[PDB]
Amino acid sequence: DLVDAEGNLVEGGGTYYLLPHIWAHGGGIETAKTGNEPCPLTVVRSPNEVSKGEPIRISSQFLSLFIPRGSLVALGFANPPSCAASPWWTVVDSPQGPAVKLSQQKLPEKDILVFKFEKVSHSNIHVYKLLYCQHVKCDQYIGIHRDRNGNRRLVVTEENPLELVLLKAK
């Protein structure tokens, strides 16, 4: 089962801030306006090391009490951008490669349940890596690739995987 930054089980359907392991390389997850988007449709990591970012909802397919380790998950904004037709993060091929975005169209479940948290080996705390799966292929990790406008975009990059500790929102 999944564990949060306080050693407790992650509540299914619950909201969490997805924080870095180490502060100095930025804060929580947010949205951003990039390219030809009329609103924040690009999921990014805040530049501010201090911050919590957006509370993110974590759900599995069976809307169960907890989320089984190695279970597919959907991740979405609790307070999503108005132009988004659903709060769920989605992966789409882009110039920077598979990018985590929001959509202006309704999405099918097969299109949202494409993430898998994976525990990283570190010591007194539960740190995760984010796996992007593709129809059952969870072999790519989500990482950061910063654009020339400064946005730390969430995309599938073959390195610099992002690591996360889950802090229960309130």
- The closest alpha carbon to 141, from 122, 124, 164, 125, belongs to 164
> With 0-12 CB in 10 A as exposed, 13-18 as middle and 19+ as buried, what is 44?
buried
Q: What are the backbone dihedrals phi and psi of residue 24, each rounded to the nearest 5 degrees, phi first?
A: -45, -15
Contact 116, 133 (CB under 8 A): yes
Measure Cα distances from 158 to 43, 117, 162, 165 in Å: 18, 16, 11, 21
Degrees to nearest 5, angle at CA 105 with 103 and 108: 90
CATH class of 1-170: mainly beta
Per the entry, the structure determination technique was: X-ray
Residue type at 33 in one-letter notation: K
HSE at residue 60, side-chain half, CA atoms within 13 A, is 18
* Chain center to CA of 128: 11
Domain boundaries, given as residue ranges, for the chain = 1-170
The rounded radius of gyration (Å) of the Cα atoms in the chain is 15
Which residues are CB-neighbours of 126 under 8 A, at least 6 positions away?
2, 3, 4, 5, 7, 119, 165, 166
Tokens of 168: 């229960």
DSSP-assigned states of every residue in the chain: --B-TTSSBPBTT-EEEEE-SSGGG---EEEE--TT-SS--EEEE-S-SS-----EEEE-TT--SB--TT-EEEEEESS--TT-SSSB-EEE--TTSSEEE--SS---GGGT--EEEEEE--SSS-EEEEEE-------EEEEEEE-TT--EEEEE-SSSB-EEEEEEP-
